[PDB]
Amino acid sequence: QLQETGGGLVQPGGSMKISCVTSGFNFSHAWMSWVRQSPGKGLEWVAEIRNKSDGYTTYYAPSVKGRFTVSRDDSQNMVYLQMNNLRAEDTGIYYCAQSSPYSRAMDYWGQGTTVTVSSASTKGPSVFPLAPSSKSSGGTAALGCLVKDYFPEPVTVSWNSGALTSGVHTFPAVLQSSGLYSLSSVVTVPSSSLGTQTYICNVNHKPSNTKVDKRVEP
């Protein structure tokens, strides 16, 4: 019923235009909104465009007014968001939605398109071992891979090419003050396996088209 496009990477000061195609309801009558989600700022309403009968009246969140422009094309069932003078704070998943005239609820949201605003160049991760500790209590050892200094999100980590899944924990990335992301992936294994079994983390980073395999040993 709704589907967003156009998101990607851009530097602070830059511009980007995103779009949303719709179906399954009368578009020309509908009010349409944009809402964005930045991981750890929840949902934030961004803009609205109505018509139903008259005006193509537009409304904006204070912090994007002037910078952002919402438009529509009734003949193609398209809503647009033109974004200029972008800042790092604008980074997020942007969703288009149908705004109800009754409750001003947003009724039917698309899957979203992500806009990432940063000075960082795309870069694949450096992958370091988190080596099992020597000695020890119950015969379980934890080991892992530190996946450091990549941009943008995301990376995927597997273990022994997907053959090791039990007890794997891959943490969410944190954005470091450098503008690069970092995470770790860990797994717990039997202490008695450490001589006989090899353990390799496979780190895939689609935006750089890089794949890095790292063996982690004592």
Next chain:
Amino acid sequence: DIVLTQTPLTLPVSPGQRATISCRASQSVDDNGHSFMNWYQQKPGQPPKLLVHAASYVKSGVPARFSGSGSGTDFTLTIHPVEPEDFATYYCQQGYSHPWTFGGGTKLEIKRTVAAPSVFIFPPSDEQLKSGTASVVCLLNNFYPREAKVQWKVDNALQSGNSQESVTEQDSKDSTYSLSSTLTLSKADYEKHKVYACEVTHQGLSSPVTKSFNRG
């Protein structure tokens, strides 16, 4: 702008029990007998979905164990009983006046018994040290509830502002969390000290647990 105070940020519920989610608006969102407060549900990697509009009107197809209530400035979403598919994040949103605003969210988490973390510490690799940075990682594995204090100490000096925590979602088998706390220092700073210690306080532990190593 109408600020919405949604409480709590994280709400444990046992399967079968009631979930009560509150949303206070900083002024009234009533007009002509309608209270303009809407509720949404979001699961990871998915858009939000409208559940309730005008405070209490459940959207068609939403199950009956969801109910919205309240008026003026105080509103409630109740889920009774909480079925396993209901564990998700919930948001309130006022449609009274522009800008439209959302509450900060409420994640329903599965209540289970207390489980103490297993704690592990990892020196930086010699490989990372070559590059000029040192990352020291403390792992707390498979614990519940989420709340845990992780202190770093470096030759007994308490560390401040050079560490970041990251926590997994509840495990799908056992409903526990795991957490990493990563201390980032320059190679220079790393080399000035000997003892690196991670102290973990969690209600599952009678006394705090320290894991440490000496650089070497």
